[PDB]
Design a protein around this nucleic acid. Structure first.
Ligand SMILES: Nc1ncnc2c1ncn2[C@@H]1O[C@H](COP(=O)(O)OP(=O)(O)OP(=O)(O)O)[C@@H](O)[C@H]1O
Ligand SMILES: [Mg+2]
Ligand SMILES: [Zn+2]
Ligand SMILES: [Zn+2]
Ligand SMILES: [Zn+2]
Lengths: 159, 773, 65, 114, 243, 134, 263, 43, 83, 98
RNA sequence: AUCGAGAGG
């Protein structure tokens, strides 16, 4: 590979380096092999980055993997959207999948969670557990036909 | 999911759409029959008694009229059965459901609604045809054609709702997209193919046509420009009268590989004070480009101005193309004889090269088909390039490629040189039979012709084997349009439902519906995604000596000394230890910024998206306040150094007397401060940009004002915007691929199933890999 | 169906040149091009009107009602 | 269904005038005249003769929409020259030229008799 | 549409005077955009047009069988003999000013087909027509004078714009919007609202004082009634107990 | 209102690059040593060959408002010349210690002039009437 | 005379090939547009079907009848339906025709435009006659009848112009050309290897001197000579077609002048 | 009418593909595109 | 509860959502025969009078910006800066 | 040299709807599929006895015309006797932007 | 109403 290294005169020079790539991940064992750089090893398996380096490094690896797919052809998407997507998947301390198993099992009101998947099971569980819905979400205000706390409706106008 | 989250609504219409160059960007042509069906309940006021009662007496038959008169009690007086005159005189507080009239905000939509630009507020214009006529520039956000497409129209039924439609969902307000911080609307089709032919050095226009074109500009001020050529014959260049459409005060400089002040090949672009100095206007300038004319006129001035600019350009260019013409025929695909044999050779040797490769084959693995497929693709591309280069400038398909209106290089290659290699599911044609692809080939045959290489072009015609191989390759382009579209719509639905409740609150933090803090400031800087441009940080790159010569000023030694010609007091600057103390602290700050930026950006990339464009403000200050370079400046060193420091304390993103919010503010506007110090250094403001005191104050005021406009507005539904901006490129990237029918695009075959892994945090990766250094 | 009267492209009458066209084709044994030129149809917009026409009326005339 | 009547291309309305003359404030001594139930047949012809007048500084016509049979003609003349007089002179010149062409064609056809 | 997937719709119908014409008076029956072909790569359209021009002029019948030895160079050598440009281009004049066009227009006969899709059979508009009996929402279908579905994706798009009154109006004023009386204690839709007497009663908790009215979609009311019929209590409360 | 730069140039090269009616000529001043010109010329109206001599004059005025068609009676300026163009200056470069260069754009046709001190009356004004005499 | 000049180089009963001179392009284009569009003609407008046993639809036959060219030499004497104080039918604003056909013969019986019969009073006007140009004497093939099939139609023909419907247009095709050589450079020729050998030389090139070889471009020259060839469907004679086109253009200009004077 | 009389339906990706063995037995071009692409064939 | 007039830590600039909601509410109120506080002159469209009132800062409404914890800040329309 | 069979004609691999396309080998395959889909929606004379059948939604073109460019397979498909289109005069031009 | 088919972007 070619790496842009700052030359002693201050310029950036594409110096060449030898980089090894394996078929299979054993990060927790390869990282301790002498002769390699432990601070630059990388994996496309962001799950193994979290289990060895932490949730924050898992967040960085998740963003890198998302970027390598969204912006591979040459397409460009602003950093804010991918950053928010990666943050939502990681604010709970682990990789929260975008699936009925991962993000639909939160403390959110049952009316928002029943509109995505497993509607009747979610409603049954809410009834059994006597869950109280605060009606602060968007789906909850859509079902009730009220002005949701969305932009232009996220505030009150008095006289 | 079928009756509550999505319902069927009243006051809606659906009709086939068609184009109309004589309609404004924000206008939509409503058929008269539809306008007489959809209605809006207008409350009678002292300011509209006469008009409302005249509409009532018109009845529900004549188009300007009404269909009902709702009273205060709630009873409705139908104007088709019951009486509609006499004591029908309206009283205050009554409602009169009128017909839709001109200049009415109406929501206008096309399915699928993959992003917020697929649903925008238009302005009604009653028309005499059953078609939703619309502007040709607004078709890009809708992804709309006029070959059978139908669209939906929703009518607001209140006064608050009309205001919401006309102040948030209006078409001019949606010109610049928050997805890729670039315009989503630009000049398209004919107008893009004429804009370059009108703006060639070879185009001249006589007086009679210039008068008509000038009259076709609705905002023309009535002043005939002086012709470019005067004595032998009065002739106006195309750039002269096209610049009438460009608003005054717009500056835009573009320099391509071949662009010079003289731009021999008319490369790049230079617009000074709304006048095209040089350069052919094409997709890079007047299209949906990152830093083109639309972005400058939208960011500067106003979106409405930009909306007017769309129509002003379109009318002139369409009138010019009406009296010029443009066609396409067989002879546009025929290549020169001597340039055809070369193409054949360009194929033949490559084919024989593949032969050599198969000799390496004999002595899972793959690494052969992969390399053979790559060689064949490269052969097709080089043959197409050899064909396109030797196509004359008057060739009609070449002009379409040059303008960027439609067509591309691959189209030239396939219609003139060779169709290329046909691949299905990412691999070349497999052996459906035993050891062969078709019964007309012998077994154990691995020649490129035997496995789906189409050596012929569309002009020459495809042989039956190549015809069948092309059909096999092109069927995959229809399967992923009807089968694999559902696998990327589920992705977007999951993304939307995951980020449905995410929004920015009034404390500038991004929170869930439970109040959980997703981000303490949206996007880690709190800036709207539509107010951002790609800008270069000058401190990060370059040599140490170059950086020093750029930003180092020494008032004591001759090594790096300010020229006294630059500054009026530049005679007594020498010495003055206090000024050197004030001047070397900024150099230390620049050095710290250089090392910090090199830490942040390891690869040293300098072009990053930042909110406020500073080069544009410098240019506007230079042109607005006419600056003569042969004159000393008026800026004291204490004003240039302390001006930026004072400005840095006015770039407020977060407000709070505590220390946590103050630290968050310092962290937020940090890289933008590095850019600001890189652009407003003493040497730059004195030598490179010979600014004055008035110009410097104007620049600082504009930077402060524009920075405070880029901060996100609390109430933004960030999560829905982020979810759409991720799945929309994937959904539109698929549902295509019938346009090329055989080319290998891994991102539609192996790209989206990888997104299916990340989103679901797939436990098992199709192909895990470890990279060690 | 019967005979294309006039000419969409221009407006020349070609509805009275069908029986003459058939007689030229059969009785005079001329080919289509010479028969079309001998009928005064110079422009190829008129020429296609008589050249490409299916006289389905005869078939509709073979039913009892 | 929604197609307009085809006699609306050349029949005036109830309170519709053939010419609507409005002064223009963009340039001195300029005027805009809207011709109703007209086409390019009589807009280009008038513009060509207006441009042949040495006391006309600007003359240009346009049809804003092909759906509607009308066109706007802007005329700006030298100070002291009424644009209405310019339009009258152009119309008179067109009439004289057409009469001369009629007489010449009639003479040529009479001589053409075999 | 032609015989090559080159579909389109009529955008305008110019008369014969406004249409461009060639030096011999031929006026096109149809005008198509040059931008249609370079991306669609329908070279067969142009070859068919050239062959049709040659066949019309010569009087023969063009042979367009797929895998034959007929080549564009052979058709061109036949069109030139008739007195036309070998590539089908023809000098056409503008119909408005009568002036020549700097670009010669590809001109010729092409076989076009009319499809079953016409606007008079697609145009629709609804102004509060018939509604369903179950959900009390607008009925489905153009033939039933029904309304268009404001699906979930459209709702998400309206959420992205940050318009909250339009979404509610599309969900309440445009559809459903049936008010229901709610007891202030049990929170269910049990209040026996006897109007014309100004008396509201809630048997089962003897509440005749704490009664409110709420404007909710009829679909929401039917959802709550189905949940009640499934042994679930979706108690709607007006005030907030926990902040 | 008066001339700004009058000189005589001998043309050395005419470049018909990709354009049928426009050619980029390069010329060297006959009288003064360091003065060169690079100008786009409409060949159809004013054909220019190699080794031609052209008198170039910067009128900047012919003695703001809408252009008026020429009429019989007046003489103004540009009556003894053969080719007249009107354009805007857009760049003033410093080539060397004793060299300056001015760039003009006559509607899209670009001109570059170089000199030492003869380019002193040239100011960054749209007033520039390039007059060329055979 | 003084301005425009004409030279009739070919004259037949259906085509006139002439050469206009000393005119601008706008006048010639306006003249040809008027000849195509705004010269009045008589054509069938209202068809009442009393009996139709034929295999053709009533409105099909009505459309075919509307396209039949009818004599319109004295069209100037009739009044428009909109301007006539009359009803759907009259004698000074319309012409009444009657078609009665019966398939008595064993073989197919052809119904021609020759079978149309004028019923109303012409009042001594050379108008309202089906036009016969075929040498066999038969007009346009209206329809065909097998046996026992009957057609009974009453047609009302009214004055109109080609703008309202193309059935009122008596100009089949008006060839219009100018500058056979590309002297004025109003057209940039498309070529592959040579531009002079790939574009056929038009016939009108025999009437102009070739543009020499290296003469300088003449930028002061305009289009003056126009080669026109006017055809006619048959309703109005070709010389009358062109004369009435000029008269109609003059009437339009005079109407604008009169409106200006009245205002 | 002829296409309808010579149609074939597969009651059910790999199945929605033009196999090499469809040469001369099933039309490579004629197939629906209304989510039944490849499943419905024509002789 | 309610943040006092001082210690308010929110943007004094009017967000587009706030501006649109204010314009819509004022337009709806004007159409319901509410006292206009500005000389409306030729304007008749209630949205036009609402815009004219906003330009002169005569709209008597007030925005209650709700923080995530439930507390709110009251910003007068006159007090807010409109750009 | 070991050929065991020969094909009657390579063009006999297409179907009923795809045998109407002229020069289908000079065309992109999705375009051929699109025409095959749209060839069944073209309006023409579906039957000679349309005037005897009481069938819903019968569409009959006034003046069907045989194509000027015909494939050799059209003879067996009876397309020159029951055509479903007309020979328009098409110009490829950016005339007015409509 | 249900069910199913076919068809358009
Ligand atoms: N299965 C589908 N799901 C969602 N949208 C679809 C689907 N099929 C078609 N569309 C819509 O129809 C459009 C496809 O247009 P169309 O089928 O006319 O092809 P095209 O891309 O316009 O190219 P061409 O007109 O040359 O075929 C898309 O933009 C898409 O929005
Ligand atoms: Mg289908
Ligand atoms: Zn014809
Ligand atoms: Zn109760
Ligand atoms: Zn009468």
């Amino acid at each position: 590979y070619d790496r842009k290294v700052p030359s002693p005169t201050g310029e950036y020079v594409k110096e060449p380096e030898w980089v090894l790539e394996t078929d299979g991940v054993n990060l927790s064992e390869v990282m301790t092999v002498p002769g390699i750089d432990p601070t630059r090893i990388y994996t496309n398996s962001f799950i193994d980055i979290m289990e060895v380096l932490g949730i924050e490094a898992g967040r960085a690896a998740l963003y890198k993997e998302v970027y390598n797919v969204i912006a591979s052809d040459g397409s460009y998407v602003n950093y804010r959207h991918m950053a928010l997507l990666v943050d939502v998947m990681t604010t709970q301390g682990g990789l929260t999948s975008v699936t009925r198993h991962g993000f639909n099992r939160s403390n959110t009101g049952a009316l928002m969670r029943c509109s995505f998947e497993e509607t009747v099971e979610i409603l049954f569980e809410a009834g059994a557990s006597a869950e109280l819905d605060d009606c602060r979400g968007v789906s909850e205000n859509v079902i009730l036909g009220q002005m949701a706390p969305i932009g232009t409706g996220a505030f009150d106008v008095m006289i | 999911r079928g009756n509550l989250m999505g319902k069927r609504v009243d006051f809606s219409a659906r009709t086939v759409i068609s184009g109309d160059p004589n309609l404004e960007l924000d206008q939509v042509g409503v058929p008269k029959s539809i306008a007489k069906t959809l209605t809006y309940p207008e409350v009678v006021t002292p300011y509209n008694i006469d008009r409302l009662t005249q509409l009532v007496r018109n009845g529900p038959n004549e188009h300007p009229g009404a269909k009902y008169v709702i009273r205060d009690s709630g009873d409705r007086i139908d104007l088709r059965y019951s009486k509609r005159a006499g004591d029908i005189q309206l009283q205050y507080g009554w409602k009169v459901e009128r017909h839709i009239m001109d200049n009415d905000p109406v929501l206008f939509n096309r399915q699928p609604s993959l992003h917020k630009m697929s649903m925008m507020a238009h302005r009604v214009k009653v028309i005499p045809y059953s078609t939703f006529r619309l502007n040709l520039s607004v078709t890009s956000p809708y992804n709309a054609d006029f070959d059978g497409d139908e669209m939906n129209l929703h009518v607001p039924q209140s006064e608050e709702t009309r205001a919401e439609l006309s102040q948030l969902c209006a078409v001019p307000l949606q010109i610049v997209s928050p997805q890729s911080n670039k315009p989503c609307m630009g000049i398209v089709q004919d107008t893009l193919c004429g804009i370059r032919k009108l703006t060639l050095r070879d185009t001249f226009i006589e007086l009679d046509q210039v008068l008509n074109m000038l009259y076709w500009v609705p905002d023309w001020d009535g002043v005939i420009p002086t012709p470019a050529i005067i004595k032998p014959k009065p002739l106006w260049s195309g750039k002269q009268i096209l610049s009438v459409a460009i608003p005054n005060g717009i500056h835009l400089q573009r320099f391509d590989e071949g662009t010079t002040l003289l731009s021999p090949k008319d490369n790049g672009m230079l617009i000074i004070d709304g006048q095209i100095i040089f350069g052919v206007v094409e997709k890079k300038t007047v299209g949906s480009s990152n830093g083109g004319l639309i972005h400058v006129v939208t960011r500067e001035k106003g979106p409405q101005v930009c909306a007017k600019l769309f129509g002003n350009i379109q009318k002139v260019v369409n009138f010019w193309l009406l009296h010029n013409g443009f066609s396409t025929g067989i002879g546009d695909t025929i290549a020169d004889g001597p340039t055809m044999r070369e193409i054949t050779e360009t194929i033949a040797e490559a084919k024989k090269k593949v032969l050599d490769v198969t000799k390496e084959a004999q002595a899972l693995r793959e690494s052969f088909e992969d390399n053979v497929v790559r060689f064949l693709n490269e052969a097709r591309d080089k043959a197409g390039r050899l064909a396109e280069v030797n196509l004359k400038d008057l060739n009609n398909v070449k002009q379409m490629v040059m303008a960027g209106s439609k067509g591309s290089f691959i189209n030239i290659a396939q219609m003139s040189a060779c169709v290329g290699q046909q691949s299905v599911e990412g691999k070349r044609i497999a052996f459906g039979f035993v050891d062969r692809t078709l019964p007309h080939f012998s077994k154990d045959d691995y020649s490129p012709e035997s496995k789906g290489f189409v050596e012929n072009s569309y002009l020459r015609g495809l042989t039956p084997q190549e015809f069948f191989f092309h059909a096999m390759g092109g069927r995959e382009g229809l399967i992923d349009t009807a089968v694999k579209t559902a696998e990327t719509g589920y992705i977007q639905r999951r993304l939307v439902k995951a980020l449905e409740d995410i929004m920015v609150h009034y404390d500038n933090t991004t929170r869930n519906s439970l109040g959980n803090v997703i981000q303490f400031i949206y996007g880690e800087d709190g800036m709207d995604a539509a107010h951002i441009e790609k800008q270069s940080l000058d401190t990060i790159g370059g040599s140490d000596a170059a950086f020093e010569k750029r930003y180092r000023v020494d008032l004591l030694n001759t090594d790096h000394t300010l020229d006294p010609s630059l500054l009026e007091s530049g005679s007594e600057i020498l010495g003055d230890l206090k000024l050197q103390v004030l001047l070397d602290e900024e150099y230390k700050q620049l050095v710290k910024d250089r090392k910090f930026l090199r830490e942040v950006f390891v690869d040293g990339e300098a072009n990053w998206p930042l909110p406020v464009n500073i080069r544009r403000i410098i240019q506007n200050a230079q042109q607005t306040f006419h600056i003569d370079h042969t004159k000393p400046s008026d800026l004291t060193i204490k004003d240039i150094v302390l001006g930026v420091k004072d400005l840095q304390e006015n770039l407020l993103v977060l407000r709070g007397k505590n220390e946590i919010i103050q630290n968050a503010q310092r962290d937020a506007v940090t890289l933008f401060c590095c850019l600001l110090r890189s652009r407003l250094a003493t040497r730059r403001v004195l030598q490179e940009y010979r600014l004055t005191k008035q110009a410097f104050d104007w620049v600082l005021s504009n930077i402060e004002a524009q920075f405070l406009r880029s901060v996100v507005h609390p109430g933004e539904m960030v999560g829905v915007l982020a979810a759409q901006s991720i799945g929309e490129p994937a959904t539109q990237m698929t549902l295509n691929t019938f346009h090329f029918a055989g080319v290998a695009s891994k991102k539609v075959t192996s790209g989206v199933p990888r997104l299916k892994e990340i989103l679901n945090v797939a436990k098992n990766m199709k192909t895990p890999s470890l990279t060690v250094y | 169906m019967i005979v294309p009267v006039r000419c969409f492209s221009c407006g020349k009458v070609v509805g009275d040149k069908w029986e003459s066209y058939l007689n030229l084709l059969q009785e005079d044994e001329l080919d289509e091009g010479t028969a079309l030129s001998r009928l005064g149809l110079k422009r190829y917009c008129c020429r296609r009107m008589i050249l490409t026409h299916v006289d389905l009326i005869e078939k509709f005339l073979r039913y009892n009602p | 269904m929604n197609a307009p009547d085809r006699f609306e291309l050349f029949l005036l309305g109830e309170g519709e005038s053939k010419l609507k003359i409005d002064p223009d404030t963009k340039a001195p001594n300029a005027v805009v005249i809207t011709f109703e139930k007209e086409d390019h047949t009589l807009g280009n012809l008038i513009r060509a003769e207006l441009l042949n007048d040495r006391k006309v500084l600007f003359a240009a016509y346009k049809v804003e929409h092909p759906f509607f049979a009308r066109f706007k003609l802007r005329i700006q003349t030298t100070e002291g020259y009424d644009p209405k007089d310019a339009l009258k002179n152009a119309c008179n010149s067109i009439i004289n030229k057409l009469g001369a062409l009629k007489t010449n064609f009639e003479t040529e056809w009479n001589l053409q008799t075999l | 549409a032609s015989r090559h997937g080159q579909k389109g719709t009529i955008g305008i119908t110019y008369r014969r005077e406004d249409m461009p014409f060639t030096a011999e008076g031929i006026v096109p029956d149809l005008i198509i955009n040059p931008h249609a072909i370079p991306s669609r790569m329908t070279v067969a359209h142009l070859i068919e047009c050239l062959l049709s021009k040659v066949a019309a002029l010569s009087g023969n019948e063009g042979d367009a069988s797929p895998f034959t030895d007929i080549t564009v160079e052979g058709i061109s050598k036949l069109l030139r003999e008739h007195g036309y440009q070998s590539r089908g281009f023809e000098v056409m004049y503008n119909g408005h000013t009568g002036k020549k066009l700097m670009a010669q227009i590809f001109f010729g006969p092409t076989y076009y087909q009319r499809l079953r899709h016409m606007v008079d059979d697609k145009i629709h508009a609804r102004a509060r027509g018939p509604m369903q009996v179950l959900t009390r929402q607008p009925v489905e279908g153009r033939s039933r004078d029904g309304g268009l579905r404001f699906g979930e994706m459209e709702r998400d798009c309206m959420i992205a714009h940050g318009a909250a009154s339009f979404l509610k109006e599309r969900l309440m004023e445009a559809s459903d919007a049936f008010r229901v009386h709610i007891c202030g204690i049990c929170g269910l839709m049990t209040v026996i609202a006897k109007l014309n007497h100004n008396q509201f009663e809630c048997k089962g908790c003897d509440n005749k004082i704490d009664i409110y009215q709420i404007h909710i979609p009829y679909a929401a009311k039917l959802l709550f009634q189905e949940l009640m019929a499934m042994n679930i209590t979706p108690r709607l409360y007006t005030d907030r107990s926990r902040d | 209102s008066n001339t700004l730069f009058d000189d005589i140039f001998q043309v050395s090269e005419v470049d018909p690059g990709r354009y049928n009616k426009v050619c980029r000529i390069e010329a060297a001043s006959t009288t003064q040593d360091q003065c060169k010109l690079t100008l786009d010329i409409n060949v159809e109206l004013f054909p220019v060959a190699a080794q031609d001599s052209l008198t170039v004059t910067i009128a900047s005025s012919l003695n703001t408002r809408s252009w008026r068609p020429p009429q019989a009676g007046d003489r103004s300026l540009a009556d003894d010349y053969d080719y007249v163009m009107y354009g805007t200056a857009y760049k003033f470069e410093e080539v060397s210690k004793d060299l300056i260069a001015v760039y003009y754009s006559f509607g899209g046709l670009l001109m570059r002039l170089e000199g030492n001190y003869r380019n002193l009356n040239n100011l960054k004004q749209e007033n520039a009437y390039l007059l060329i005499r055979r | 005379e003084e301005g425009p000049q004409v030279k009739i180089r070919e004259a037949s009963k259906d085509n006139v090939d002439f050469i206009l001179s000393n005119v601008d392009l706008a006048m010639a284009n306006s003249l040809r547009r008027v000849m195509i569009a705004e010269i009045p003609t008589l054509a069938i407008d209202s068809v009442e079907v009393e009996t139709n046993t034929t295999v053709l639809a009533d409105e099909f036959i009505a459309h075919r009848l509307g396209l039949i060219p009818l004599q319109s030499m004295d069209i100037e004497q009739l009044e428009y339906s909109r301007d006539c104080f009359c009803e759907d039918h009259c004698d000074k604003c319309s012409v009444v025709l009657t078609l009665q056909a019966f398939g008595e013969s064993e073989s197919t019986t052809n119904v021609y435009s020759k079978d149309l019969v004028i019923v109303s009073n012409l009042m001594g006007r050379n108008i309202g006659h089906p036009i016969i140009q075929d040498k066999e004497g038969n007009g346009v093939l209206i329809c065909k009848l097998r046996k026992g099939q009957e057609l009974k139609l009453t047609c009302v023909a009214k004055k109109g112009i080609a703008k309202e419907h193309a059935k009122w247009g008596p100009a089949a095709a008006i060839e219009f050309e100018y500058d056979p050589w590309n002297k004025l450079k109003h057209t940039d020729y498309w070529y592959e290897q040579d531009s002079a050998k790939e574009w056929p030389q038009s016939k009108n090139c025999e009437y102009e001197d070739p543009p020499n070889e290296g003469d300088p471009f003449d930028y002061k020259a305009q289009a003056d000579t126009f080669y026109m060839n006017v055809e006619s469907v048959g309703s109005i004679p070709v010389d009358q077609v062109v004369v009435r086109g000029i008269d109609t253009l003059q009437k339009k200009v005079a109407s604008i002048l009169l409106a200006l004077t009245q205002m | 009418t002829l296409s309808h009389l010579r149609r074939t339906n597969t009651p059910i990706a790999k199945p929605r593909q033009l196999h090499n063995t469809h040469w001369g037995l099933v039309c490579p071009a004629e197939t629906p595109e209304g989510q039944a692409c490849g499943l419905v064939k024509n002789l | 509860k309610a943040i006092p007039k001082d210690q308010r830590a929110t943007t004094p600039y009017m967000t587009k959502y706030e501006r649109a909601r204010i314009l819509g509410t004022r337009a709806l109120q004007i159409s319901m025969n509410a006292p206009v506080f500005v000389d409306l002159e030729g304007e008749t469209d209630p949205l036009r009078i609402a815009m004219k009132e906003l330009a002169e800062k005569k709209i008597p409404l007030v925005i209650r910006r709700y923080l995530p914890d439930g507390s709110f800040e009251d910003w007068s329309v006159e007090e807010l800066i409109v750009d | 040299t070991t050929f065991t069979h020969c094909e009657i004609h390579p063009s006999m691999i297409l179907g009923v709807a795809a045998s109407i396309i002229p020069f289908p080998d000079h065309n992109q395959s999705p375009r051929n599929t699109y025409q095959s889909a749209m060839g069944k929606q073209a309006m023409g004379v579906f039957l000679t006895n349309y005037n005897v059948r009481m069938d819903t939604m019968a569409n009959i073109l006034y003046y069907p015309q045989k194509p000027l460019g015909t494939t050799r397979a059209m003879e067996y498909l009876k397309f020159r006797e029951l055509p479903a289109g007309q020979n328009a005069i098409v110009a490829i031009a950016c005339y007015s932007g409509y």
